[PDB]
């Protein structure tokens, strides 16, 4: 007994891609002064005002593979208890995100939808909310008794769910259509496999709904355990490139999973506080014990990113502990490449760990070596446990006018100016920055090779100027290359970098090895490492 089933409810998607109005079809809202007031962010780090003006029920643009729509899956699949966490959540964010999985859900495949207040002190959270769930046989809520934060919250959560399966989304969501079975099939076929949806964006500000950059990608992190995404490597993409594909780390609140398999896991560090973390301890379990992590690019949700975080956090709380709490008990020696990055995680207390640690050795998993050389096997390419040194680091003299490369610290976009050479001799008071650093990445940012900042040399046209935007290490508009003829050759430009005698900023122009205005001069470097990635 193994029939198929094409679960698309086309006539939905008839009606809903003939809806009118205002944020339908997923389309930017029309902006108007009474929206674009700092007062519609303050209660959820995201527009609120938009977000009032837009549907419950609105529509949201196919952006699948193109393969998404003509796949099938198994006619019989296990129920899903649906579990969504909320504290202080929007009114209208949140309902819209029930109504979604209301109306794009097979209500036969979905067990339950528990909503999770975790102690929410607005109003509308209380008797409205509980009046018009009411309404809604499925919808069922359950509150804590005090702050719990999002871990347990969720744990809280899986611990009264029924279904087959537990998925988790965060509370102001819209599933796409026809999510749910490519997540409830793949598990069906292997019940240790935690499923992760394609996360799409959903603006705080216009509530556009898009992919994220660089759409499918691979999740991963930096040393200082931020949540990183990186490409497929070539060699593990698939065929089909509408079909699942293994991932590191998961995102962390759009999942589904076996509820068995996760309680055999143990759920979630109870131990973890209000928020992060947990996305990092649930990862490295499924894989370093017996379970597996897939992306299904079949199945998309949007999610909306905020702009700042609006609730409150106890006193007494730190990402910190969190962190160094799963740094100790999955990690093993590399959580020394942590502490390296962030020494106060040395002597900070990470609680009682003990208990955790014993669920790692009854479980019988593999090391974290294993985890980084087998399944991470990518992640030190962008970011390396140890940074390799770099070309070259001080201040950028132009042999021409003779001045240094500076920067009135506008990490924003300001242009890349020239002034005076200061030397650190000079008054801190002009706002000078004439520290720069060609990082093994073969990009230059500011500041000393030990503490650069975020920001590369970003420059467009092979004539416009050099701005400071925020790096990534895709060799592109922030691929730079120092000659021996002294120059800082651009070839995604194919021209080089020229500064102008008239005393203005530093912009773009063709190559001329023979010239000054365009010859610049770094205080140390290392032609070990420019003798590298010069030639082709
Ligand atoms: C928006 O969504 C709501 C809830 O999903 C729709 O109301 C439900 O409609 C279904 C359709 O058969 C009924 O089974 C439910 O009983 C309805 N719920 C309630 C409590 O009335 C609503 O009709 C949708 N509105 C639009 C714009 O289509
Ligand atoms: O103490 C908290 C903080 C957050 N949340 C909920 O947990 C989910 C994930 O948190 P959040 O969206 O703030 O994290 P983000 O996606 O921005 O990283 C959301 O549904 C929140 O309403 C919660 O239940 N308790
Ligand atoms: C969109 C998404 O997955 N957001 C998650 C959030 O829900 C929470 O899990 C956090 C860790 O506390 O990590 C974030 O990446
Ligand atoms: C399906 O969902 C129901 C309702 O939560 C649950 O009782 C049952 O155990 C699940 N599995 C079956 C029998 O399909
Ligand atoms: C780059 O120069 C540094 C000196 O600062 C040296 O330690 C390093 O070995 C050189 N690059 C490599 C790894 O060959
Ligand atoms: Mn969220």
Known sequence: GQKLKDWHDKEAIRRDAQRVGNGEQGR??????????????????????????????????????????????????????????????????????????????????????????????????????????????????????????????????????????????????????????????????????????????????????????????????????????????????????????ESPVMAGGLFAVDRKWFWELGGYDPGLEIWGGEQYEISFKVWMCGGRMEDIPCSRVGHIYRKYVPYKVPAGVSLARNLKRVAEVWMDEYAEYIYQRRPEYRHLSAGDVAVQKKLRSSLNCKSFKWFMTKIAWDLPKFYPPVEPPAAAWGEIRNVGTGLCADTKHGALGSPLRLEGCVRGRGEAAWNNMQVFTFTWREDIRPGDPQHTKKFCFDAISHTSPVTLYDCHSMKGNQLWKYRKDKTLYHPVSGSCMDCSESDHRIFMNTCNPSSLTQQWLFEHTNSTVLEKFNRN
Request: glycine fraction near 4%; include cysteine.
């Open 28 to 245: 930017p809202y029309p902006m108007t002064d009474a929206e674009r007031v700092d007062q519609a962010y303050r209660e959820n780090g995201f527009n609120i005002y938009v977000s009032d003006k837009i549907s419950l029920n609105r529509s949201l643009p196919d952006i699948r593979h193109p393969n998404c729509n003509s796949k099938r899956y198994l006619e019989t699949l296990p129920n899903t208890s649906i579990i969504i966490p909320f504290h202080n959540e929007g009114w209208s964010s949140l309902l819209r995100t029930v109504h979604s999985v209301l109306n794009r859900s097979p209500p036969e495949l979905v067990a339950e939808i528990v909503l999770v207040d975790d102690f929410s002190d607005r109003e509308h959270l209380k008797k409205p909310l509980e009046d018009y769930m009411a309404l809604f046989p499925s919808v069922r809520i359950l509150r804590t008794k005090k702050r719990e934060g999002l871990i347990r919250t969720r744990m809280l959560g899986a611990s009264v769910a029924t279904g087959d399966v537990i998925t988790f989304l965060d509370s102001h969501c819209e599933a796409n259509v026809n999510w749910l079975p490519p997540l409830l099939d793949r598990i069906a076929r292997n019940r240790k496999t935690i499923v992760c949806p394609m996360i799409d964006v959903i603006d705080h500000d216009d509530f556009r709904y898009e992919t994220q950059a660089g759409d499918a990608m691979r999740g991963a992190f930096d040393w200082e355990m931020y949540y990183k995404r990186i490409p497929i490597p070539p060699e593990l993409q698939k065929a089909d490139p509408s079909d699942p594909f």
